Amino acid sequence: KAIPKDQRATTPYMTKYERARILGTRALQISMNAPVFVDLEGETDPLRIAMKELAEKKIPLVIRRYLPDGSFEDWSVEELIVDL
Template sequence: MTEALLDIYRRAVSQRLSRFELARVIGARALQLSMGAPPLIDVSNIEVRDPVYIATLELINGLLPMSILRPRETGEYELVPVSKLVTPEVKRYLSSILESWNISRRV
């Protein structure tokens, strides 16, 4: 690959959450919730009280005050807020997971 293509690829990848980062963020927040942290959304009208479900809803709504530490090419690290990395595609993907979660609970 040429240097220009690599630069385009790096910029595109650096602006999205990887599947591993996504799992880590949801898992970390779910652990906080299971240890007694207050939810950042109103859970009074939510049928499912699972911490993973609530953490996913918080992520979709952009309420998580978390950042990801990412290495730069210079060897330094930068903190990137999770809310900047959640794209509409990720929100649709997570919403479809939550919908299937609700359907499976009804069966």
């Protein structure tokens, strides 16, 4: 039933899988002519556009992390650390 942001306990870093899904999802959406929130500086490959959206933390997505019990923490890709 979702955990309040001030009580979140998971890694504040982004996981290989989170990132691969984030990049993949945006690139899909970009491929489908969705709005791009970055200057494609001559870019044209939706992945690289997405890798670039991610590099500038302008991806308006949220990872909803599920706990084994069913509850969850929502994390903004804004706020996730990407030393990954």
